[PDB]
Amino acid sequence: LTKSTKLTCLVTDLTTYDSVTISWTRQNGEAVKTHTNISESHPNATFSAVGEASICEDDWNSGERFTCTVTHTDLPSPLKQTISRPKGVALHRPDVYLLPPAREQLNLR
């Protein structure tokens, strides 16, 4: 719809610190382009960070393994989050049904 096939990993409830960078690594370990538009802290004393990257349409449909690594001071071990399209699934045509409200609901006006 928008030709904006980007993927991001969001971190919440972490401490409101600085010097945070989110780098995306593929299955071969090669690096990708960086990102911009770093968000700010929230009034609830919770930091928010977003890591943006640009991938190709063919790469996503090829089932490549993409991993997002978090670099936070509190966590001693950088967690790994794997995002990939599950291949081998069939395609079905969605059926859209519209249910009008019942006559028992249009009583209180």
């Binding site: 010097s19 945070v20 960078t21 670099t71 001071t73 001693p76 071990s77 950088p78």
Partner: protein, 97 residues
Amino acid sequence: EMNPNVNVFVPPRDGFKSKLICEATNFTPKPITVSWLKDGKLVESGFTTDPVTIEQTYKVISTLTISEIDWLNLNVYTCRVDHRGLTFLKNVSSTCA
């Protein structure tokens, strides 16, 4: 001829950029070479070596400039000391990271 001791200091656990200090003590003769490594890669800039002072024993200190984010990202820093044809490598990391 005594092998120099290799010690690397780390920033405090509860916060401080920062600097890395590698100290070689109780070595002879006075001339000595000290370098720095980053994840097994040679460092080309960002490090300085102070003049060797007299503590007969000598003392040499080196300073490496590092960033706050890279230090806690589990990067490998190794201090290389060459003395009398021998090379010493010490690997350090953050205890809390």
